[PDB]
Amino acid sequence: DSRPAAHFHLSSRRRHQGSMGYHGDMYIGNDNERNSYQGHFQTRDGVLTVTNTGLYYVYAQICYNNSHDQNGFIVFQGDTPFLQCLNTVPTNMPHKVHTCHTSGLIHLERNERIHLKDIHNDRNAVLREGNNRSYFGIFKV
Amino acid sequence: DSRPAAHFHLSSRRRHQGSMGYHGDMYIGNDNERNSYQGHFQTRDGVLTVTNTGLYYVYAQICYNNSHDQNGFIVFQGDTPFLQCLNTVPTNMPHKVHTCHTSGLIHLERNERIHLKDIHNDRNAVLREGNNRSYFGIFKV
Amino acid sequence: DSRPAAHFHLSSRRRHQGSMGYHGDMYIGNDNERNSYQGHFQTRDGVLTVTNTGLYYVYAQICYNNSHDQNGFIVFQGDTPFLQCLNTVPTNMPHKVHTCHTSGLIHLERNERIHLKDIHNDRNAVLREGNNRSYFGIFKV
Amino acid sequence: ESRDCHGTICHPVNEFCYVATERCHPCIEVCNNQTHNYDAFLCAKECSAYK
Amino acid sequence: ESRDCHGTICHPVNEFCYVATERCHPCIEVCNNQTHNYDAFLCAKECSAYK
Amino acid sequence: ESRDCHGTICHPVNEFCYVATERCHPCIEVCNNQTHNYDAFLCAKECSAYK
């Protein structure tokens, strides 16, 4: 039965142009098979819309697998960057794999939205069906 | 009084052979002295068993203190890897200390189980009584 | 309307001398504008005091931006280090930016306190109004 | 063109205001082909005057 | 013996499919005694044909 | 003065018990001006006898 809570497997990314110069790639999440939140959330194009005003706890994780020294992503409250994660992994070693995880409380009013965007463009991250390395979720407190 | 919530101090590890080639060491957690979850959880050999079906939020953290470039662990839902954390810390510097933290929502049916396993074998991590660097916990949402 | 939950933007730091040789800088957090917890929490000098006994979930994140190989902070339950986060970022590269995030369940009795302190002194971290890189929060479970 | 990066003025040709570090960053790190930090999009959008 | 690592075929003797990176990995990194990445269990189980 | 760092005895002049690693740490890493790990407070409080 439906509950305002959901776990999303990040399965793909889309090019996206933001409000205020945030042009990083938008992460797209697939429902876990046991998700059931009809009437509490709506999801389109990687944007999650909240049905009723409330206080929600959100967690987000991206697993990077590229050569770049700096990587990171942003959780947006509307068009405002609210939560963020960043990693620095130096040297030119090719085998760089690391998860970036963050979380926090976000007060969302009715019809307010959140979405997940990378800081960079075309950065390789682990994206796949049933992803157990990059995921994000939300539940009302 | 008992509540389906618990915080565990990771105090030791055991060699463990998994369902599908996951042969990393199993982490063993000790109860925090204020834990009280009689009738909600059961714990044996590092495996936590859920008494009633429900949606649970789990967090897990391991603090590594070894020389290896790559480290990480897995939270298992049954025998399926569900949550994961990975760190890359390069160079041959001897003083490598880092915490790997992840979390997520896990829908657990009655008698379903979760457990915590490292990706590698015989990797030094901080394990001790009342551990304040490696821990893991769970609570029903 | 007030609820035992709050999200804090870490806006400054203060020199602080601890119970048991913990002399790292104390982090000071500003309320998010939608915080409302009258009668549930009290905050002075970076110390949060809990009004009623209960089980609380806390999350903490500091975004470091300095040259040091090792960085980290501690969440204190009273004067006891309970939660911790640590990062190792090697080499002498000047552009080191990384978030350290941890969380856990803390059973707090009435009038018990928590506070956030760095492991080191005068380490540059991201501290500002409406901080979206270093923050910390709490809510009752 | 504004090189103001959190109060610090970047070099007009050799630097850009990097979003990740919130500091002025050398354009050579993202524009050089041999380096592991090569980023064609960043080099094109942030370091137009470089080289 | 299957060297298929997420579609990529590893070198039959000098590489193994590393669980951490989900990529083909050089056996010398885990089999060499001087390196800080030496892992006797990984070398024994993943790189039997190496050296 | 106790150099006992989790059972390991640090060098009386060249080492200190580092809180971050919970290991004995070389004083030169925090006392040297050229290094990126220079920490004046740590050097003054943990490595009084160094140099």
Numbering used by the authors:
A (entry chain A), B (entry chain A), C (entry chain A): 275 to 415
D (entry chain AAAA), E (entry chain AAAA), F (entry chain AAAA): 31 to 81
Quoted from the paper:
The Drosophila tumour necrosis factor (TNF) ligand-receptor system consists of a unique ligand, Eiger (Egr), and two receptors, Grindelwald (Grnd) and Wengen (Wgn), and therefore provides a simple system for exploring the interplay between ligand and receptors, and the requirement for Grnd and Wgn in TNF/Egr-mediated processes. Here we show that trimeric Egr ligands assemble in hetero-hexamers with both Grnd and Wgn, with Grnd displaying nanomolar binding affinity for Egr, which is 3-orders of magnitude higher than that for Wgn. Altogether, our data provide insight into ligand-mediated activation of Grnd and suggest that distinct affinities of TNF ligands for their receptors promote different and non-redundant cellular functions.
To shed light on the mechanism of Grnd activation by Egr, we set out to determine the crystallographic structure of the complex. To obtain diffraction-quality crystals, the Grnd30–97:Egr146–409 sample was subjected to limited proteolysis, yielding shorter constructs assigned by mass spectrometry to Egr269–409 and Grnd30–81, that still form complexes in solution according to SEC analysis. Grnd30–81:Egr269–409 crystals diffracted to a resolution of 2.02 Å and belonged to the P321 space group, reflecting the threefold symmetry axis observed in the complex. The architecture of the hetero-hexameric complex consists of a core Egr trimer bound to three Grnd-ECD copies positioned distally. No major conformational rearrangements of the Grnd fold can be observed upon binding to its ligand Egr (with a rmsd of 0.674 Å between the free and bound state), that associates as rigid bodies with no induced fit. Importantly, in the Egr:Grnd arrangement each copy of Grnd contacts two Egr protomers, implying that the trimeric state of the ligand is essential for the organisation of the high-affinity interaction surface with the receptor. The TNF domain of Egr adopts a typical “jelly-roll” fold, with an inner and an outer β-sheet composed of five antiparallel β-strands (conventionally named A’AHCF and B’BGDE, respectively). The modular interaction surface is provided mainly by the Grnd β-hairpin that snugly fits in between two TNF domains and the α1-α2 loop, strengthening the binding by His66-Asn67Grnd-mediated polar interactions.
